[PDB]
Symmetry: C2
Subunit: 135 residues, 2 copies
């Protein structure tokens, strides 16, 4: 895959999960791009077997597409949770996540998950961390 392919797979997965389908116009709306650009990427994703077109349902993810898709959403949400946990201003988070999500190895994602769990199981840790920043 590529960062762009992942940006699209993530968005398509989100729409199907939210609406039950992923229309070109909806994808174009979420990414602020022309539908023709969407169709070009969809053709590529079809060629690479991440999805297929079904007569009425339209765009449908293959098993490969759904598995990766769910993990891309996982990554995005974990990174948002990570930044939120360490005190980053809410207004900054989405921009930072989108800027780094496609450039962080899964090993790093794995370790970040352990870091988030670390603070999740004991608020005294979040308190000690917070005492460092305001200081």
């Amino acid at each position: 895959t590529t960062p762009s392919m992942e940006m699209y797979i993530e968005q398509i997965y989100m729409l199907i999960e939210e609406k039950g389908y992923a229309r070109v116009s909806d994808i174009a709306e979420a990414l602020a791009v022309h539908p023709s650009s969407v169709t070009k990427m969809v053709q590529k994703l079809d060629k690479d077997e991440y999805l297929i077109y079904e007569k009425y349902r339209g765009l449908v993810l293959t098993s490969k597409g759904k598995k990766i898709g769910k993990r891309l959403v996982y990554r995005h949400e974990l990174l948002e949770q990570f930044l939120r946990i360490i005190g980053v201003d809410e207004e900054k988070i989405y921009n930072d996540v989108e800027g780094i999500e496609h450039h962080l190895s899964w090993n790093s994602i794995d370790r970040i998950g352990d870091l988030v769990q670390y603070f999740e199981e004991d608020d005294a840790r979040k308190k000690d961390l917070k005492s460092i920043q305001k200081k």
Copy 2:
């Protein structure tokens, strides 16, 4: 400064610190860019006053450029320290830092800094974190 600009200033700052000069050939090899493209970017940085020609030394950082370069190197080093502290495979750290450093807000950088010193003040916290990775 744009991410591309920061990428160049960071590398130029480093070359000057280690060699005393930043030759196009050394810049091109370190950034994996052809010397032709370096030349074009350097001409722009010179015009934008981030770089300036000096007798004997050649292309050097201006006061504006050196101040920025110092910040960029700080950011890179802090990010390497961060990933190393949370357990990221040593062989994957550099690529990740390289891919996220230009896309993170300074807010996130400062909060990562708080996290780094959080673990640095008590080895017990590091052990508590590693135990999570173990399981």
